C-alpha cells in the first residue's frame, strides 16, 4: 500500500491543476487566455501544486514553450523556483525542459540565468527499484542520459561542473553506466572526457570514487555493462607493434589485479548478486589474467592444498573406524529382541599401544580442525566450519567421556568427505558438477520437497492407521508412527521391497491404498522430480565453461585473502624497469581475421 | 613461466628502441629528424636491439617507407642484415615488409638486391602451438599465406625457388594447407602451380614429401582441410562423357588406396588425432571407395572372422563350465558358518573320457589364444591381448595345478564375450553403440566416478561406525569395513533392498543418516549421471553414420595390416589394359541437379 501514496499525490496534481484556472491554462497552450488571465488582472505566481508545482513547471512539463514565454514577464523568479517535497525536492523547470529532450527554453532559462547546479534531491530521483529511472541530481546529469548532445554543450558553456556528485557521490560518468541503453550512452562518455579540460590534480575525473569507493571503470564491471566495459578498456590498452595478422597489445591491469588492499575488480564481480556481472569474465584482458593466475601459482597451490585435505580425512577415518569399544559387560538386554547392541564405548582405556597410534592420530584431526577455526575467526565455509565443530564436539564428548559419541562422528564424517568436492573445481571437466548439485538441491529440490512432503504425510499416516489392527510381527513396516514415515519415504524412492507377506491376509484397505501410492508417487511424482533435475543438468552443461571460470576466480581471490606474500607474487609483468612506471601490465598476442 | 621470457625479451625491444634516439627516430617517420641525426653526425648502423633489431628493421616494422628511404644511403648492407637470435634468427626486413602486406620497399630492397633465399629460422617461426602462425622460412613462403599476389610475382621474377623447403622439409604448398583461411589461400595453390614451369625430373613439385613423408595432397587430408582437399581432387579426376544429367568421372586413386607400403591416406586419417580430419571421409571419391571396399571383400571376410570368434568362445565356455571339481573331501569347515564351499578343484584327474573331450576343448582355446599373441608380437587390442593372457594364465595355473584358478577364468570370460562387440561394427544400425559405450565410460563416467567415489567414502564409512555397536547377525550389511563399501555401492545404484529389520530397533543415527543418503545419492547424484549419459547418446546418434563410416575404414586398414594377398586384391579398376597406365582408377556415376 506504499506506492498508492505516490499515486494519490499524483492524482492530486491532476486535481489541483484541474481546479485552478491558472494552471489549467498552463496545461494547454492558450496564450490569449493567459493574456487576459495574467496581464489584465492580478494573480499570484506562487500557486503551489500537489508536491510543489508552479505553472511555469507545468508549461515546461506539457511541452509548452509558448505558454512559458508568457510567464517570463510575470515570473522573473520562478525560473529559480524548486519543487517542494516528498517526490520532487529541488527540481526546477531547468531540469524538466531537459527531460523533454529540448524546449529551447533551455536557452531562455539560461537567458534568465537559471542555476545549473540545482539538485533534484527528491525521492523519485534517488536510486531505487521503485523508481523506473536514475538520473542523479544535477541537470547536467539529466542531459547526458537522454542523449541531447548540443544541450549538454549548452550546459558546459554556462559553467556546469562535470565533477559534480549526487547523494551517492556518483559523478555523471557513473550515471551513464547505469543506463540500459548501453552503446547509446557510450558516446556521451567520449564527449564528456573531452570536457575534462582543466586537469584537476586530485583526479582527471576518470578515477573518482563514489561513497562506496567505486571508480566508474570498476562500476562498469559490477553493473555488468560489458559494452561500456569494452570501450573503457580501449583507453586502458597500449598496443605495441602489429605484425601482419599478429598484434602485441599491452593491457594496463591496475584496478583489475589485486593492489594494496584496493579491493580489486575481480572481488566485486564475485561478491555482487547481479549475474550478468559475471559476463565480464569473458572479456579478453580479464579472461587471460585468471587463466595465467591459475595455470601458474593458482592450480599447484590448490592441488597442494587438496592433497593435504585428503591425508587429513584418511587420518580421520582411520582413527574413527578404530574406536575403544568394550563388550557390553554391563546390563542385559532389558527389552526383549529390541536392544540389539553390544559395545557401549570404553571410558578411559588409553592403553594398548596400538591406541597410542590412535591417540596420535586423534590429535592430528583435532589440531587440523582448530586450524580451520583459526582461519575462520572472521556455501562451503559453512560446511568446513561445522565440520570442525563436529570434530571439537566429539573431542569434548570424549573428554567428558559421555555416551552419545556416534552422532558427532557421523556428522563429521560425511561432511568430511563431501567437502573435498570443493577441491573438484580445480580439475576442469569436473568443476561445474558441484554447481549441478547446488541448483538441484537449493534451486530445485527445496522448492519441490515441500510438495512431496505433503504426500508422504498422507500415505504414511494412512498406512499406520491401516496397520494399527495388524500384528507388527508380520510386516513391521508401520509398527510406530515415527518410523512409519521413514518406511514410506523409502517406498517413495523405491528402496524398500514393498510390504507384502503372502502368508497371512492383508487388510482390505491396504491393497487399495498402496496401489494408489504406487501410481501417484513411484512413477508419477518421482519422475517429475527426475524431469526437473534433468532439465537443470542440460541448462547447466550448456554454459559450463563460464561457470568453471567463475569458480577459479572465486577460489583465487579466496586464496589471496587467506595466504600471505613471499610465495604468491602478484601476477603480470612489472613496470619500472622498462620505463613503464609502477603499473604492472600484461601483454597478449592475437592473430586477426 | 616460459612464455614470460618471450615478453621480457619483447618489452626490452620496447625499451632499447625507446632509450636509443636513433631507433626511436626509426619508429616515427620524422625524416627531418633523421637528416640531422644521420647525415650530419657520425652514428653507427649496427645498433642491435633486444633480439637483433636494426633501425632498418624498425622502419620496415612500423610501416615507414619514408624512414627506410633515408636509411638506404647510410645502410647499403643492412638490407642483407638478419636478426640475431632466440625468437628471430635469419629474419631480415625483406621478410618483414612482406608481412605488412606491401611496402614497395620490396621493390627497393630488390633494387638493393635483397637475398630472397634468406631463412627465418627463429623460434617464433617454427611450428608450434605457442606460435600463433606458421609461415616457414623463405620470404616467398611468407607472401603466399598473406595473399599478396603481385608481390609473389615480384619474387619469382627475382629468382625465388618455389622448390625451397623449411626445417620440416615443407615446401610452400605445404604451408598453404596449414592456413586457417582455406579458400582464401586456395587460389595461391592455383597460382604457384603455374610457376612449376621448369619441370624437374624428380617431381613436378606437386608430389614432394616432407621429412615425415607427406605429399601436400596427403597433408590436406591429415590436416582436415576439406576445402583444400576438394580443389586438389579437381585436378585428380579425369572425367569421361556426360549424358544429360549423367556424368562419368574417373578418379585417380593413387595415393588414396593402399600401395606398396606407401602408407596410404586412409591410414593417416585414422591415426591422426585431429578429429576434423575425419571429415575427409565424406568426400565423394573417398566415401565411394570405402563403401566398395566394404560391400565386397570387407564385410564377408569380417563376417567370416566373426563366426570363428563365436565358435571360439562357445568352445571356451563349454570347457570352462565343465571343470574337474571333486567334493571337498579335505578338511571340515573351520570357521563356523563362514566357509560355505565344497569343491577345491581336482589335481591331475584327466580320466573319465568325457574329460577327453574337455581336454581337446581346452587345447582349442589355448591354441587360439597363442594365435592372437603371435599376431600381436608387434581400444580393443588391449582387450584381446589381455584376453589371451588370462587364457595362458589359467593354462599355467593348471599346469602348476595351483589353487586360485577361478579368477583368471572370470577375467577371461567376460572379456571373451565382450570382445565380440568389436564385431558389432560391421553390422550397421549396431555400429556406433560401441562408440556410445566408450564416451559414456571414458568420456563421462571416468570424469564423474571421482565425484561419486567421494560420497560412498562418506556414507559407507559412516554406516560402519553406526553399526559398530550393532550385532551383525541382524543387518550384516556392514559387519566389516571392506564389504561396507560394497554394501553402500549397491545402495547407491539401488540394488540392495536397503537395510531394515523391523524386528529389533535400529540405532537413532541410522534413520537420519540413511535418509540423507537416500536423497543425495539415490535420486540426486545417480540421475545426474543418467542425465550426463543421456546427453552423450543424443550427441552421438545425431552423427552416427559418419562414425560408423570411421569404424569401417579403421577395420579395413587393420584387415590389411594383418592379412596377406592372393585373397585380398587391391580395390579399384586396374589401368594398363585400357591405355591408362599403372594407376588404378575408379569411376562413379552421378545425376546432376
UniProtKB/Swiss-Prot annotation, chains A, B:
Post-translational modification: Glycosylated. Phosphorylation at Tyr-134 by SRC leads to an increased calcium influx through the channel. Probably dephosphorylated at this site by PTPN1. Phosphorylation by PRKCA at the calmodulin binding site delays channel inactivation.
Record's keyword terms, sorted: ANK repeat, Calcium, Calcium channel, Calcium transport, Calmodulin-binding, Cell membrane, Disease variant, Glycoprotein, Ion channel, Ion transport, Membrane, Metal-binding, Phosphoprotein, Repeat, Transmembrane, Transmembrane helix, Transport
GO MF terms, alphabetically ordered: calcium channel activity; calmodulin binding; identical protein binding; metal ion binding
Residue positions binding Ca(2+): 497
Extracellular side: 322-358, 399-404, 468-480, 501-511
Subunit structure: Homotetramer. Probably also forms heterotetramers with TRPV5. Interacts with TRPV5. Interacts with S100A10 and probably with the ANAX2-S100A10 heterotetramer. The interaction with S100A10 is required for the trafficking to the plasma membrane. Interacts with BSPRY. Interacts with TCAF1 and TCAF2 isoform 2. Interacts with calmodulin.
Name this polypeptide is given: Transient receptor potential cation channel subfamily V member 6
Species this chain originates from: Homo sapiens (Human)
Residues represented out of the complete protein: 68 to 678 of 765
